[PDB]
Amino acid sequence: GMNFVELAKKRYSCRNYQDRKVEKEKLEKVLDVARIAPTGGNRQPQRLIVIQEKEGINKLSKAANIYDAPLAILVCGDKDKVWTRPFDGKQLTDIDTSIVTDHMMLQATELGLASVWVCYFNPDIIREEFSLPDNLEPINILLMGYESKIPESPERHEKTRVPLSEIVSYETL
Amino acid sequence: MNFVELAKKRYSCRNYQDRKVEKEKLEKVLDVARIAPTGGNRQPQRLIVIQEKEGINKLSKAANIYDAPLAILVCGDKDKVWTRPFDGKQLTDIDTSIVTDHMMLQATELGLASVWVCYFNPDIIREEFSLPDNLEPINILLMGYESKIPESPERHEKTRVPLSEIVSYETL
Numbered sequence: 151g152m153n154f155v156e157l158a159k160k161r162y163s164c165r166n167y168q169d170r171k172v173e174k175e176k177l178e179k180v181l182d183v184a185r186i187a188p189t190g191g192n193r194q195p196q197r198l199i200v201i202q203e204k205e206g207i208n209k210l211s212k213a214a215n216i217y218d219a220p221l222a223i224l225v226c227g228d229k230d231k232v233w234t235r236p237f238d239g240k241q242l243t244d245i246d247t248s249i250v251t252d253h254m255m256l257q258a259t260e261l262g263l264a265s266v267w268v269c270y271f272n273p274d275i276i277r278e279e280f281s282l283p284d285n286l287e288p289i290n291i292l293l294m295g296y297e298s299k300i301p302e303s304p305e306r307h308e309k310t311r312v313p314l315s316e317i318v319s320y321e322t323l
Numbered sequence: 324m325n326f327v328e329l330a331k332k333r334y335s336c337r338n339y340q341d342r343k344v345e346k347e348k349l350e351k352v353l354d355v356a357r358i359a360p361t362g363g364n365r366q367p368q369r370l371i372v373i374q375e376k377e378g379i380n381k382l383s384k385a386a387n388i389y390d391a392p393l394a395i396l397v398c399g400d401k402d403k404v405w406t407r408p409f410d411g412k413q414l415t416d417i418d419t420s421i422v423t424d425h426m427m428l429q430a431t432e433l434g435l436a437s438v439w440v441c442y443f444n445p446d447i448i449r450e451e452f453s454l455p456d457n458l459e460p461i462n463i464l465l466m467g468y469e470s471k472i473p474e475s476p477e478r479h480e481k482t483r484v485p486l487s488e489i490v491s492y493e494t495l
């Protein structure tokens with residue numbers, strides 16, 4: 151099988167999805183790592199809504215373009231559970247849920263699933279449509295399915311990323 | 324080894340050997356910070372690799388870093404990151420956390436123990452590393468070699484709530 155960098159390179163953003171549904175067996179594997187993931191203080195504030203049926207897909211579609219993906223997971227963070235930093239009041243809500251989302255997205259990739267991470271949504275429409283209580287904030291939508299065209303190349307990053315030297319320095323800025 | 328095995332075997336290490344992290348392994352860890360996606364491909368992450376005395380001592384002023392031999396301070400650039408117009412929410416924590424997660428998983432594959440740290444004094448970090456106002460320190464990822472036997476990959480039955488408490492289908 152592939153090593154981690156090969157997996158990380160293979161993953162790309164898919165916006166062209168087949169009709170084909172995600173097999174229950176693959177969805178369950180994707181979910182398992184949402185639990186295995188670490189969270190600040192082990193607080194486990196992540197709250198997931200698995201969406202693969204028509205009403206929910208339509209509800210998400212009121213808030214975002216989900217590109218006819220056959221499966222979406224709405225990842226919320228529970229601010230009643232999350233750790234809060236004493237110095238400045240910063241809450242780990244986005245961090246914890248993103249670790250969870252990233253773990254899912256990598257696991258989905260291993261299983262041959264295409265995906266795209268979606269933050270371009272109207273959070274108010276999501277709150278209303280899914281009747282979210284005040285303590286749950288919708289953070290990420292992860293879409294998954296089967297690519298309908300040609301996957302992006304695992305060696306594209308020379309063209310799609312800035313050089314490493316532009317994001318890393320040593321000891322000081 | 325498959326992905327779930329890698330994610331299971333990762334745990335939070337709080338006691339490290341003196342052994343330094345080899346350059347070859349650090350470079351592989353950094354490689355995935357670039358590979359990782361960010362919202363809009365904005366690539367706002369700004370990393371400071373800390374493996375020398377002064378920098379390790381600066382971190383220790385701000386946080387408990389468990390005498391780790393290597394730290395990466397992961398900042399987000401507010402001048403690059405997307406700000407969502409609807410509500411003003413910035414992707415700073417999201418984009419940086421994808422990067423940091425990729426790094427932590429890569430470190431684990433290479434036999435490096437690690438711990439993610441957010442319990443740090445951000446004003447101390449800002450001052451000590453002379454961060455400009457556009458750079459927000461988000462995560463400190465610590466790495467090295469574990470001093471004792473790692474935590475079990477099969478521990479999650481005890482160290483996590485049931486999947487049923489975090490997942491529902493279609494509706495809450």
Ligand SMILES: Cc1cc2nc3c(=O)[nH]c(=O)nc-3n(C[C@H](O)[C@H](O)[C@H](O)COP(=O)(O)O)c2cc1C
Nearest residue numbers: 162163266267268269270360361362363364417418
């Ligand atoms: C936090 C985050 C939010 C994103 N939001 C969206 C989104 O709302 N819609 C979309 O089509 N793609 C979205 N993207 C996908 C990015 O455009 C993509 O990751 C980036 O351009 C790099 O492309 P690649 O993933 O194919 O390497 C998002 C990605 C990230 C990491």
Ligand SMILES: Cc1cc2nc3c(=O)[nH]c(=O)nc-3n(C[C@H](O)[C@H](O)[C@H](O)COP(=O)(O)O)c2cc1C
Nearest residue numbers: 188189190191192242245246334335439440441442
């Ligand atoms: C966002 C985040 C911030 C964390 N901050 C700290 C920290 O400041 N200090 C620390 O000792 N552990 C920190 N942890 C480690 C967690 O306590 C740990 O991941 C959790 O208790 C689960 O244990 P495990 O990682 O061994 O499975 C952090 C973890 C995450 C994900």
Ligand SMILES: [Cl-]
Nearest residue numbers: 270362363364
């Ligand atoms: Cl985007």
Ligand SMILES: [Cl-]
Nearest residue numbers: 470471472473
């Ligand atoms: Cl032991």
